[model samples]
Target chain A: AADLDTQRSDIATLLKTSLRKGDTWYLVDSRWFKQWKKYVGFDSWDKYQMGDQNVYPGPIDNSGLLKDGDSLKEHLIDELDYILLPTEGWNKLVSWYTLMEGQEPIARKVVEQGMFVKHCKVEVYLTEFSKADTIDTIEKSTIQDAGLY
Target chain B: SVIQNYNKALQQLEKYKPYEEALLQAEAPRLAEYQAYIDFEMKIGDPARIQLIFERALVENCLVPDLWIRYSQYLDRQLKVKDLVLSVHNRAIRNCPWTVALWSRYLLAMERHGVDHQVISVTFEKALNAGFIQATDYVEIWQAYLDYLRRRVDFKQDSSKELEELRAAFTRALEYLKQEVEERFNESGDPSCVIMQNWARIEARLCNNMQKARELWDSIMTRGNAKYANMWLEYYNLERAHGDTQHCRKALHRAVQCTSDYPEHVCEVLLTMERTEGSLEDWDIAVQKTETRLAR
Candidate 1:
């Protein structure tokens, strides 16, 4: 009972953290999965399966909870994340892979074995940060620390 | 500062090397080691290094929404800043309404921001009410408004009055859209599903009339195309609210059956069925199906 309660609490905290960031996760049901498939024009998800491999967008700060090609678990993190990452740019790569010749083996391996699940979740994060009473804007931080190359 | 330099080296390494090399340089200790790793990777790698390099730049500042926005552009899947792109752009616009550059930037950003197909109904309404921008630019403004409404529907739980005000604004926008469609498309038929869905939603929330909402949904289903699946979902919601579980189930089944080619939709229906009937097996299947689809 104690262990169950602790697990519940941790899950609740994870959910709360996501919600506080103005994001929501919709666990994909059959209905959403179908719609999503049609929307993206994919016949099957057999292209993204990278189970237990070092997926690039794994946890930051070296939490090391995830590794490359590990059945890549996905959450909305935020819906905005989709717009920024997969929807805009990575989507191009996905398209590229889908259309490429002689890439079928790689695509099939990634989708069939690599993916953890299919769902789109959305979240929001702060745009500015204040450290020592100094407001650091996103652009400012980028420009100051690493001159855009 | 060291961490920042470490991140920069990672970006440079990514810009010039393979994924493994970029990851290695990203782990390099000391600024000198990091720079050396980056130089070596660049010398040996392909230009495709842009992928990880751009990603590292974004992740280094994931706390910042704009960087998240930029980074989201690079991820193979929706990395972050998914739906909030429009809202973020709207907030940016509120700060600089007349800044055409900003507005244009926001507009360009929104072109890919995923507005609901329903916005097709409000083209004219949004143009007229779009205080600063013009008709040619109305789609962007309308998208912003749609994003505002969607966020409100998803997030806001309080301030009923504010919600009502927003509903009113959306209703007016829809009316304008109907008029515009009539004029532009040269159609004399009834208001499109795009306009009616917003109106029905506003009526449901503001008037608390489930029957009327159902009627609106019914109209949408009868007139709408395959793309109007979301409207059908809304209709199901109205049926659920009106205590017509049987009807909702039937509708759910029909929705599922209509898109046999898309197993994901079937999974969605199965999940909803589980939700209504409290079946753990159905729920498990839904989970399994989704996992299978995404991983693929």
Candidate 2:
């Protein structure tokens, strides 16, 4: 029970390489795979195929290649690190790849194969961000500009 | 004497303690209080102290674009040092990269300090990707870049690589707005194509390429602006400067048929043009055209 609770709060530990000005790891749903692949560059995206019957990651993440009927969602990192990357903006959170420095190719390969997921950027996930800052700025910042009594 | 002056400055700094303490005690960081405090410090005429106050306020209020602009502007016109001016410009953009004021001022500051062309060009590319709030911000930012490209060219040269790049960048600016900006904003920010207009003027005036200038003006007209009287007049103005009388007469003639806002104004301008330089036969044609248009 202690180990499970420690794991729940501890967040994922990303490998030390080129990416991340930040150190802590954040988790997102498996649905953000299609969203993140668009950003990880063409080599990693087009290397494997979906629904190709004899593939690996298309079938799963522990393996890099694709196989038909395998699910990448099965091994998604559910716990996200919001401490390092605060939830400032929703759009910023969604397009998290833009914030990352360099999720280089070999680095990306390890993320998918060993970590059991594709996204390796050490940033907060969109689903994990509370969006409290976004609301705080909208309602409060403008009135501050207005010089309220 | 030294201790007394130091103590006097300390006296001034402590006077702002109540407002500073109020900001910390308040529920939110009031922009008004921050703006007021900065103004109070700026009135003291000490750059270091003013900068200290500005940095402290920005620690929390960094996302506010107006605050960044005010601070950077101070550094720009007052401090005017390489490190001091540019550090604020860079930080302003880093905090609020979407603000065109920061990027524009940064570009200007970089050029003022004689930074490399490639570096300025790279900064412009990042600004283009910054995803601004309004469509018109793209227009303002592209104009800033276009202006920089234009200033690099030596007008005396009939042709050069700098001129070539300037012309190509103008074309790219138009395409980027039409394709990328229009996709997101649902309308191109430059509907009348102001960049094209300025490029046409440069071609006519500096390059002495009336053919290319006329081609660009034609493109501008066809882009949903052919009917504006002011647009045709602008074209006429360009023609009057570098083009011959034949092209001038031809432009006003086209304006008579195509101008929707005011036909009589076009007619009057045509009559005035012919009166100034046209033969009697040409003047007669202008009068006949005006009479027929008025009757219609």
Candidate 3:
């Protein structure tokens, strides 16, 4: 119970960090999103629910988070490609997996990476190469070249 | 003296006027300021100014049913102008048609202001079609409508159109609950069977129809309600009040046999009733049955 309490507290802090004021996040339930859509005159939730990928209106700045020429849909897709599961959502998944299959350590190891010191799940993916990532690309290239991709 | 206070409240309201415009542009406008301004205006006892503040607040917050309720109640309590009260209620229900409480209040306001009976009936029909969220809300709305129907009947006549309409409404309400409400919500909202009880009491006391009352009580018991002590006691009292000793004794017997929640209480009542009107054989039977029940 104490361990669960600690995990809950840690997850709360991690959620606050990940869901900062300016960042966009998709909630699992669509009811709240629908109400907010009606209130703010935003058509994002309706378009998203209808399977439209390019749904976010361009830099309307109603929420004061968008930059000029920024595509909300592209930003969301990039963020989602490198999915970050907060500690609480991760803990719930782990608890369910452990209850069903009785494998806690295996599930914990599934999301862990080296040297990040982050106790939550993070997924990394390769995206477009930028000028600043020339060295980072070489480090990843070594791993991929060693047939560990 | 009051004008000065109203003028001061108007000045305070002016300070919060910009927030209302900002509310249209921003998602997180200072709603507290708007609310506080309304409160201050209400405190100053200026009805027209309070009404204006509610109108502005509701434009941005129309999804909130409580705001509609507050606005309607203010119009009802202070303004007392029938047209204005009815207009606000009509708009409130139009915006919040799914809210059963709003429908109930609308019906009550109509009745309170002595609106025509036909208008009230049509409003009730609209309420029934409002698609409330819970089965219990439907039951409550039906109860409010039934209350209104009951008030319209003049009990002095042997038979009247209003009484027949009330009876038909009772039957329709029961069928509606059984068919639509329970089917959709998957639970009967009349948990205590109060509607049937009311129907039975109305038939027995007002219409003087014991047979119909008995039939209604039988239906109430069949709804898995035989185990409730209060239900049995209610039936027993109904029989004792408007029925013969034979039916009263029969109800008590069934009550003692079926009441699981308060068997001891049922047994005591059975014994008491038997003591008052029973022969020696009846007393012995009552005592034997109560003893067997207590032993169990």
Candidate 4:
């Protein structure tokens, strides 16, 4: 419980620091993946798949936590260190996506891999975060409902 | 005083260092701090620092077209080194090929630096190939190319290869805009009738081909450009300079009828032309037409 509290405090600080720049930081969730695919042009996906080894399984949308107000907020607390794609990177990715056309998925994969491979530690902190304790309660409820608690 | 300003600038630079360090340490560096740092460096007016700042900004923000343009302009206006200017422009065009302003400025920079004709031609061809966002951008790019071609021609030589190329380019530009650019963008790129006007003027003054100029003006007027009094007056001036009184009178008559935007201006030109070189009957006709148009 003490370890969990420390983790929570660290995550909360990271979230507040990240969100100071506003909503430009996109949480890597299912909706984000869908939106990102559309933004990058879906027709270009196959070309990346052909040459790239790293296959993006898309954004993690399933949190098993019931929504209390904003779902994005709830998900953020649940997966605080998930990848947070910045607007600047997204803009750069889109340009490459448009210019490369059929090869946009390759560009997308390159950017995704670069986010982790090149700067793993810093990128993890740059991921999504939230202040909602509703996520903790939801996790407890799920364990209780499953009769595992 | 200079030392004081320098010290103040150094203090500001010191203040920006932590933000820069924060950016350097981060995976995806925040843009606001970088922009602020760059702005501070630019305000200091230190060429070396400005160049360094732009280099750093572009390492992260290479996809930003405005940054690319600002960097290119700084190189062109301040550095004025041909090789450096051309290299930066080449990189900018490569990054943002769809930007017409970059391509147009690149052409101008090439001209200013006296680049080879073949290189300029190839760059213009690449710009045409770059899928621009608007139809009007295509027109502007074509104008830049045509202007370069016009400057290459020797007006003293009657049947020069350059003249033939210039004429051929004009024909190609019109055809391309009508058939390709308009079809793709669903709007005419040559909205102001600039190409036709230039073609007519070049044929009239440079080639001494009055008949060809007249034909071009006729085409220009037919393209819904007859409503503008300025278009009419441009035709009138071309006739007055290179053509006889008959064409001038005919142009002003058409102007009086077609110019709805500023009928008074066209009417005044007609009256002035009639007064200068017209019979009593012509003067009467001009007065009647002017009064009738103004009344309407």
lDDT of 2 by residue, B110-180 (tens): 99888999999999999998879988899999999999999999888655668868988987898888898
Output the lDDT of residue A74, model 3. 31
* TM-score per model over all chains: 0.28, 0.62, 0.59, 0.59
For model 2, state the Cα shift of residue A85 in Å: 60
lDDT score for candidate 1 against the true structure: 0.42
Model 1 chain A: which ten-residue window has the lowest total lDDT? A108-117
lDDT ranking of the models: 4, 3, 2, 1
Which candidate, 2 or 4, has the higher lDDT?
4
DockQ result, candidate 4: 0.00
Candidate 4 error regions (>4 Å): A1-149, B1-32, B276-279
Look at candidate 3 and tell me the lDDT of residue B212. Answer: 63
Chain B structural similarity (TM-score) per candidate: 0.36, 0.91, 0.85, 0.86
Give the range of the ten consecutive residues with the poorest summed lDDT in model 3 chain A.
Answer: A112-121
DockQ values of all predictions: 0.01, 0.01, 0.00, 0.00
- Kindly give the stretch of ten consecutive residues in candidate 2 chain B with the minimal lDDT sum: B22-31
Q: Fill in the DockQ of model 3.
A: 0.00
Candidate 2 lDDT over A39-70, as tens digits, reads 23212225344323333112112222222453
Q: What ranges in model 2 sit over 4 Å off?
A: A1-149, B1-7, B14-27
The number of the candidate with the highest TM-score is: 2
For model 3, the interface Cα RMSD in angstroms equals 32.0
Give a tens-digit lDDT track for model 1, residues B66-109.
43333334331333354544554554445444333345445345
For residues A5-56, write the lDDT of model 3, one tens digit per residue: 3443453444444332223222111322233233333332232333233332
